[PDB]
Design a protein around this motif. Sequence first.
Motif, mmCIF file in Angstrom:
data_model
loop_
_atom_site.group_PDB
_atom_site.id
_atom_site.type_symbol
_atom_site.label_atom_id
_atom_site.label_comp_id
_atom_site.label_asym_id
_atom_site.label_seq_id
_atom_site.Cartn_x
_atom_site.Cartn_y
_atom_site.Cartn_z
ATOM 1 N N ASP A 1 0.774 -1.387 -0.040
ATOM 2 C CA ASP A 1 -0.068 -0.101 0.168
ATOM 3 C C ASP A 1 0.810 1.207 0.010
ATOM 4 O O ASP A 1 0.579 2.368 -0.712
ATOM 5 C CB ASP A 1 -1.094 0.079 1.212
ATOM 6 C CG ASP A 1 -0.448 0.001 2.546
ATOM 7 O OD1 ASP A 1 0.435 0.834 2.904
ATOM 8 O OD2 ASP A 1 -0.665 -1.050 3.156
ATOM 9 N N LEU A 2 1.978 1.152 0.535
ATOM 10 C CA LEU A 2 3.062 2.435 0.557
ATOM 11 C C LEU A 2 3.556 2.700 -0.864
ATOM 12 O O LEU A 2 3.206 3.729 -1.261
ATOM 13 C CB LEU A 2 4.303 2.072 1.239
ATOM 14 C CG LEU A 2 5.394 3.043 1.220
ATOM 15 C CD1 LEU A 2 4.876 4.599 1.672
ATOM 16 C CD2 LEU A 2 6.588 2.619 2.076
ATOM 17 N N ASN B 1 1.951 1.625 -3.674
ATOM 18 C CA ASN B 1 0.797 1.880 -4.127
ATOM 19 C C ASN B 1 0.119 3.223 -4.148
ATOM 20 O O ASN B 1 -0.215 4.117 -5.399
ATOM 21 C CB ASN B 1 -0.375 0.914 -3.691
ATOM 22 C CG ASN B 1 -1.009 0.140 -5.070
ATOM 23 O OD1 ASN B 1 -0.110 -0.175 -5.683
ATOM 24 N ND2 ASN B 1 -2.276 -0.274 -4.672
ATOM 25 N N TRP B 2 0.149 3.964 -3.000
ATOM 26 C CA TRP B 2 -0.061 5.360 -2.867
ATOM 27 C C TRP B 2 0.859 6.072 -3.607
ATOM 28 O O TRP B 2 0.841 7.097 -4.318
ATOM 29 C CB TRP B 2 -0.141 5.549 -1.186
ATOM 30 C CG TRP B 2 0.442 6.999 -1.088
ATOM 31 C CD1 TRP B 2 -0.576 8.174 -1.021
ATOM 32 C CD2 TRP B 2 1.512 7.720 -0.554
ATOM 33 N NE1 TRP B 2 0.022 9.152 -0.807
ATOM 34 C CE2 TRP B 2 1.309 9.193 -0.477
ATOM 35 C CE3 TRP B 2 2.900 7.094 -0.317
ATOM 36 C CZ2 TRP B 2 2.605 9.917 -0.124
ATOM 37 C CZ3 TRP B 2 3.804 7.791 0.022
ATOM 38 C CH2 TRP B 2 3.617 9.155 0.195
ATOM 39 N N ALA B 3 2.110 5.405 -3.465
ATOM 40 C CA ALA B 3 3.374 6.334 -4.184
ATOM 41 C C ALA B 3 3.140 6.489 -5.745
ATOM 42 O O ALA B 3 3.415 7.405 -6.526
ATOM 43 C CB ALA B 3 4.744 5.931 -3.867
ATOM 44 N N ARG B 4 2.658 5.171 -6.257
ATOM 45 C CA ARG B 4 2.412 5.348 -7.699
ATOM 46 C C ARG B 4 1.077 6.206 -7.940
ATOM 47 O O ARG B 4 1.076 6.784 -9.331
ATOM 48 C CB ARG B 4 2.505 3.771 -8.062
ATOM 49 C CG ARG B 4 3.931 3.139 -8.584
ATOM 50 C CD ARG B 4 3.717 1.730 -8.784
ATOM 51 N NE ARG B 4 4.954 1.247 -9.137
ATOM 52 C CZ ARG B 4 5.448 -0.019 -9.113
ATOM 53 N NH1 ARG B 4 4.564 -1.032 -8.473
ATOM 54 N NH2 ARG B 4 6.422 -0.438 -9.605
ATOM 55 N N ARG B 5 0.222 5.724 -7.139
ATOM 56 C CA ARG B 5 -1.175 6.530 -7.594
ATOM 57 C C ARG B 5 -1.201 8.052 -7.440
ATOM 58 O O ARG B 5 -2.203 8.662 -7.872
ATOM 59 C CB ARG B 5 -2.353 5.788 -6.986
ATOM 60 C CG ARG B 5 -2.652 6.241 -5.571
ATOM 61 C CD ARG B 5 -3.717 5.770 -5.133
ATOM 62 N NE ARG B 5 -3.924 6.184 -3.576
ATOM 63 C CZ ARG B 5 -3.795 5.431 -2.502
ATOM 64 N NH1 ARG B 5 -3.178 4.326 -2.620
ATOM 65 N NH2 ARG B 5 -4.143 6.087 -1.375
ATOM 66 N N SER B 6 -0.380 8.565 -6.566
ATOM 67 C CA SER B 6 -0.510 9.973 -6.288
ATOM 68 C C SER B 6 0.666 10.932 -7.349
ATOM 69 O O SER B 6 0.444 12.082 -7.190
ATOM 70 C CB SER B 6 0.151 10.121 -4.705
ATOM 71 O OG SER B 6 1.143 9.307 -4.641
ATOM 72 N N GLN C 1 -6.909 5.715 -10.317
ATOM 73 C CA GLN C 1 -6.319 5.678 -9.164
ATOM 74 C C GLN C 1 -6.618 4.749 -8.076
ATOM 75 O O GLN C 1 -5.936 4.234 -7.409
ATOM 76 C CB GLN C 1 -6.202 7.247 -8.407
ATOM 77 C CG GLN C 1 -5.415 8.254 -9.163
ATOM 78 C CD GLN C 1 -5.290 9.472 -8.252
ATOM 79 O OE1 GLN C 1 -5.871 9.544 -7.412
ATOM 80 N NE2 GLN C 1 -4.508 10.409 -8.884
ATOM 81 N N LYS C 2 -8.021 4.583 -8.154
ATOM 82 C CA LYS C 2 -8.638 3.432 -7.314
ATOM 83 C C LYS C 2 -8.334 2.050 -7.782
ATOM 84 O O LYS C 2 -8.252 1.272 -7.084
ATOM 85 C CB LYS C 2 -9.994 3.489 -7.129
ATOM 86 C CG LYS C 2 -10.582 4.764 -6.057
ATOM 87 C CD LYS C 2 -11.970 4.979 -6.278
ATOM 88 C CE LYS C 2 -12.309 6.590 -6.327
ATOM 89 N NZ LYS C 2 -11.657 7.236 -4.923
ATOM 90 N N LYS D 1 -5.158 1.503 -6.624
ATOM 91 C CA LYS D 1 -5.128 1.311 -5.019
ATOM 92 C C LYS D 1 -5.087 -0.052 -4.546
ATOM 93 O O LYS D 1 -4.830 -0.485 -3.426
ATOM 94 C CB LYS D 1 -6.105 2.259 -4.484
ATOM 95 C CG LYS D 1 -6.230 2.529 -2.999
ATOM 96 C CD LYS D 1 -6.932 3.626 -2.550
ATOM 97 C CE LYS D 1 -6.900 4.218 -1.091
ATOM 98 N NZ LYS D 1 -7.891 5.012 -0.704
#
Lengths: 95, 114, 63, 297, 208, 51, 176, 156
Positions: free
Chosen positions: H12-13, H15-20, H141-142, H145
Amino acid sequence: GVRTSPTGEKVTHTGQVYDDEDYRRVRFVGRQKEVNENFAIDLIAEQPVSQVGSRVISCDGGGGALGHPRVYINLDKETKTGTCGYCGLQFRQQH
Amino acid sequence: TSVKPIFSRDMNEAKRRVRELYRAWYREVPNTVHLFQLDISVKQGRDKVREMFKKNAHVTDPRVVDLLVIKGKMELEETINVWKQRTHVMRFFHETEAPRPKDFLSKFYVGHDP
Amino acid sequence: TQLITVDEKLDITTLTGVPEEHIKTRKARIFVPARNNMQSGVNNTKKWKMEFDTRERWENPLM
Amino acid sequence: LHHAVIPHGKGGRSSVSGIVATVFGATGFLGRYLVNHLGRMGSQVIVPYRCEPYDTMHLRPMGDLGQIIFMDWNGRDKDSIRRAVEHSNVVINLVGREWETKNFDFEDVFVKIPQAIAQVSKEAGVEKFIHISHLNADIKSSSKYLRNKAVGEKEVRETFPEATIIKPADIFGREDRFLNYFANIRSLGKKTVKQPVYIVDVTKGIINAIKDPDARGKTFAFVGPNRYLLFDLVQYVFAVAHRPWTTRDKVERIHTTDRTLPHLPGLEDLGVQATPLELKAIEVLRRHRTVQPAKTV
Amino acid sequence: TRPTVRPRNDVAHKQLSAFGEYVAEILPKYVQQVQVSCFSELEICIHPDGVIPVLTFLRDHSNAQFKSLADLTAVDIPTRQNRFEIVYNLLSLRFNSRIRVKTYTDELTPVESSVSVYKAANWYEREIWDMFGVFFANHPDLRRILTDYGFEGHPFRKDFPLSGYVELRYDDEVKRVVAEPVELAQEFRKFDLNSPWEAFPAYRQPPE
Amino acid sequence: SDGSSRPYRCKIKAPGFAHLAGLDKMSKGHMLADVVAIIGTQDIVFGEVDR
Amino acid sequence: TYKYVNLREPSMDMKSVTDRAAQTLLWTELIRGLGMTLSYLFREPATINYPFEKGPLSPRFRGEHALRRYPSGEERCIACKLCEAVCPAQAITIEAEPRADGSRRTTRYDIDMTKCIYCGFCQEACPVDAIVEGPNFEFSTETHEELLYNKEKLLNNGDKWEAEIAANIQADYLYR
Amino acid sequence: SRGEYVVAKLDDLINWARRSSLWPMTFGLACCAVEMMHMAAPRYDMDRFGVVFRASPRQSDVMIVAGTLTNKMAPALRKVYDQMPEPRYVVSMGSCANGGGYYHYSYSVVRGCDRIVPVDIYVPGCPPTAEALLYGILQLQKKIKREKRLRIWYRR
Ligand SMILES: NC(=O)C1=CN([C@@H]2O[C@H](COP(=O)(O)OP(=O)(O)OC[C@H]3O[C@@H](n4cnc5c(N)ncnc54)[C@H](OP(=O)(O)O)[C@@H]3O)[C@@H](O)[C@H]2O)C=CC1
Ligand code: SF4
Ligand code: SF4
Ligand code: SF4
Ligand SMILES: [Zn+2]
């Protein structure tokens, strides 16, 4: 109210059910078959019969310009109630 | 029956232009193969050039073969520069196409196409 | 004179770009279309029409 | 023959070939080529995938709309296999890893999984089953790979009497592990003889085995047109590449000669012309670039 | 007649008819027909052999001054032996006029290029080749401009179908996009919409 | 119009089609970084240019 | 009726020449540009916080297609095939048969949303207001076949959005 | 156990970095590109989502095919997609890149850009509104996620 064919797949309001030997049901496994739970014929089957006193009635579907075009229905035949061709409502003469 | 010619007055001039176009194509084929890092050999490309040249060989109207010479010269000029990609060159080799049935029995088996 | 007497056959089959499968296995039909019997009009029966025979059309497996 | 499975069309992308194929492990190399060959003729392909869905992304443009159905599955979950194969009319088994792992060793990927797939397909009443094994698979082999292949193919043949067993020798291609393994080494030379077979030829042989009804219950052997010694092969590989991950089992497999099976049908019995290595080595190894052919025995 | 009908112009009709008579009597070698439409548009149907002089006249006469070239349109009518109708549209800025020059040409016979009259046509008729196959002799640079490089045939001909003969799709085995025979997911539904009744009595053809 | 309810031929003339035809004469003697401005000063939209 | 832009002759006196020299050396028009950028820095930005804020739209908005119903439970469409005849993209496929009670109803009403250009010809050609280009626009899908609507998906969309499509058509129908 | 929880946290770390920080490659083909530029307006303002404007195609993470993909452009688009580094995502603007739309039966129009490149998010419209593409980007993005790369790697 929908029916249930004995393959587990629901029945559409048209009457389309995949057979037991139809492979296209593999498109449904892991997903759902979207059907309509409000059958139109059953929804209009509970509408009451409007009793009028005129030989020729006029129907426009209600609301004027928001309904179907105005159609005239003859109620001379007492055997069968005069049914509007657009909205499906039926009218009956009192006499 | 009298018509206005395009470039060739008779059949001999059209034959000479066919010869010149084939000569230029035969000169270009190794350079075209090397430039696009093609997977074919030089002789396979020259065989394809010959196969097109002999497929389009049953017409005797000088104006028709003159127009075909002009179109082949446009093809040659487009291959002179880097205007086509690898796809446009490789389109002549129908490689991904499945081979259609040719005899009557297999054509009868596969469908109704004559 | 700038004019050449050519008596050769007028054939442009190699200039249209059509594949050979659609110039030898097809049957062109030249006809005057029949009048639609539910109407009395005859304005559609004044020009000749060229049509091709119907090939195979099947059902899409998806939808 | 049901009406929804009768073939139609002209064999194009939008045509109907009437093949409902479940390809196990289709996200790999041979599975990718098989899905590409099956989708171009208008077939229904059911792909069970274990990895991330993103890794299956490249399998989307292989066919028309709805012709490829991705669904999840697990190797030790029998109900997922029953879910996958209960609607298909042909099952293809291509499950195999070059190296053992902590969760799935060689026995559980080569013995348990193919036997379970074959048993599930037998209970679900499928028609055609294909199992992919190795040509040099022997019980008494020194390495674990060929031992497990031989035991698994024996169990598959015992479980399914109409199981078509396909035995490629060694496959080279764009995403292979034979020429790409040799060219990237910058193990040694031996006396081993190998006859590699092009991947497109193997895929076309599999498709031709799908098409005909006489190939059920056979045991084919897909071998190349020319036999090569290993030293000349690696010299040719280094010469094409303009040059001057590993394990012990792969080391054993490289130093094992390709056996000859004259009693089994090959590529020519299915109408497949075996493409030699000299016509595809340039295409395979053009990526490594920043020539005399190898001698054949 | 007054509210819902477009008003008719008569002085423009008279001036266009007078100029059409003047043109037809000033170049009798190449002009064949001169017509003025109902909405005041002048069309001159001339021989192909006068493609260069007549337009050049309209480029350089003191009383014409048709300096601007607006259109170069090819119309394909398969029922004629000269199935291509090459149409030039000219605009005169000094007299504020628009004119139309029409000529006929079949598939094989060429027409002399009008580059030396208007250079804009140096592109325009190029597109005509790329859409029709009408060869323009003495063109500086004549090749395809709109279609694909490996395209066979000309699309705007009336015998060419709506969908082409080939379609492009990407194949991973050859790692390339390739052309395949066209197979549509849904056939283009041809709608029969022609009325069986006569619409305009003034446009009726005489019987055979 | 052929008399039916469908057009026989409908040519679209683009203002940007003739404007791009003069681009060879437009940029004669200029620098390679000036074509991003010579394209700019003509309202060239590649929808109506390519039809 | 015509004005000469860029035909202003500059003054040749010492005042204008010295002022232009001061503009060239001291970058006075560049200072003006800096001042304009500073003034436009401090204004409140027009950024609306999507999805917590939404853009202004009209009741005539053209979006996702839907099939409406009468205020008695019966489907509005009578399978008259006007929408499939007027559709410029041929996204609408209609197949019909007389059903059990004899009413003229559809059996297959397919709209290819990947083919449709959202032109609203079907919503105006429909004589009974059955098909409506509804107000929904947030229906992006992850798969191609999810954009190939059948009759059941359109009827579900109509049942879902009728509570606002009826209000929109009530507010809009006097302009039609 | 420890391992599944640790790889879930790391998943999830990243994943947040890629999606943000989704950096796009805009294909300026047709009308839908102008609609993308109007989504780049200060009103809608993609840049607050971590989405830069007009990045180079060698560093972009996502590609938005906005417009009609003809036959003459498909090899170029495939080359651009092959050049863009992994992981790569494709978002389809308009009916043209979805299924051809208006020009589905034209002779020189590819019927959908799915035939050339794998497509993740289909955005419907002609053109889809700017907030519709913003919702599609949030949907992408979701989709990122809920990716499970590290969990699948540890399970395999
Ligand atoms: N070396 C060769 O080329 C030869 C191979 N063969 C056989 O052909 C078959 C295909 O080979 P190849 O394409 O190279 O193999 P790959 O390694 O490229 O692909 C294997 C596929 O099976 C899946 N898979 C692997 N192990 C498991 C497991 N334990 N549980 C579930 N799924 C699993 C993989 O999923 P994921 O996406 O997670 O990786 C992938 O989809 C194998 O059985 C192999 O033994 C035969 C002769 C020669
Ligand atoms: S909005 Fe226009 S293009 Fe879309 S379905 Fe309706 S008529 Fe067809
Ligand atoms: S126009 Fe309306 S009533 Fe007619 S077929 Fe279409 S949806 Fe039904
Ligand atoms: S989908 Fe519509 S708006 Fe978008 S590029 Fe195509 S025609 Fe233009
Ligand atoms: Zn009524």
